[PDB]
Amino acid sequence: SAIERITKAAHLIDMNDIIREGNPTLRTVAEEVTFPLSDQEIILGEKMMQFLKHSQDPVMAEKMGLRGGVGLAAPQLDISKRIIAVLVPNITPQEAYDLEAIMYNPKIVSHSVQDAALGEGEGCLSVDRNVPGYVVRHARVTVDYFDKDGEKHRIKLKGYNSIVVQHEIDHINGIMFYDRINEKDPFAVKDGLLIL
Length: 196
Ligand SMILES: O=CN(O)C[C@@H](CC1CCCC1)C(=O)N1NCCC[C@H]1C(=O)Nc1ccccn1
Ligand code: NI
Hints:
Blueprint: H1 2-6, H2 39-56, H3 58-64, E1 71-73, E2 83-89, E3 97-111, E4 115-117, E5 137-138, E6 141-146, E7 152-157, H4 159-172, E8 193-195
Parallel strand pairs: 4-8
Antiparallel strand pairs: 1-2, 2-3, 3-6, 4-5, 6-7
Bound molecules: the ligand O=CN(O)C[C@@H](CC1CCCC1)C(=O)N1NCCC[C@H]1C(=O)Nc1ccccn1 and nickel (II) ion.
The ligand O=CN(O)C[C@@H](CC1CCCC1)C(=O)N1NCCC[C@H]1C(=O)Nc1ccccn1 binds at residues 56, 67-73, 76, 89, 122-126, 163-164, 167-168, 171.
């Protein structure tokens, strides 16, 4: 299985572990994890974060053939579990990362009326092509999740962090970024939509 393969001590996640469009796992609703977590579920989250860090190191990324990424969801590894990792760099920054988290069973429990979209659109490590347009999301979200120790966290996100976490939560619900582009005018700006 993918989880057995990926959670070996020696394994480094790379693009050959990341499934692409067409694989039905990307369109399936992922299963909640139960607590306590298995060792494999803990290691998996750690391996996903290690992938993100490798992908943001230009030297390592070049050596491993990685596309640089800011989030990853377990279904993208063919693992239908509600586990995500997010690593959003800060834009000379005092700290490297705006947000660094491995989240188990993440859930949006509140959201703003205002919407938001990245001005440059979105891409996805599972999508080997460009789809232009504003990916319409909630501007701000309150997210509950559990950490690898089983502790519950409630966080509030805005800006880029909010977008990234919603992209990954979509993956665990079988949703892809282009599902949220307006089919009639990909660059429409509706009332209450904040373009970032
Ligand atoms: O499910 C998760 N994914 O599909 C990986 C995606 C997640 C983000 C896309 C937009 C919102 C969340 C991802 O990270 N990207 N999209 C594919 C290739 C580019 C890459 C990216 O934005 N890279 C980046 C940006 C700034 C700094 C460093 N790297
Ligand atoms: Ni994606």
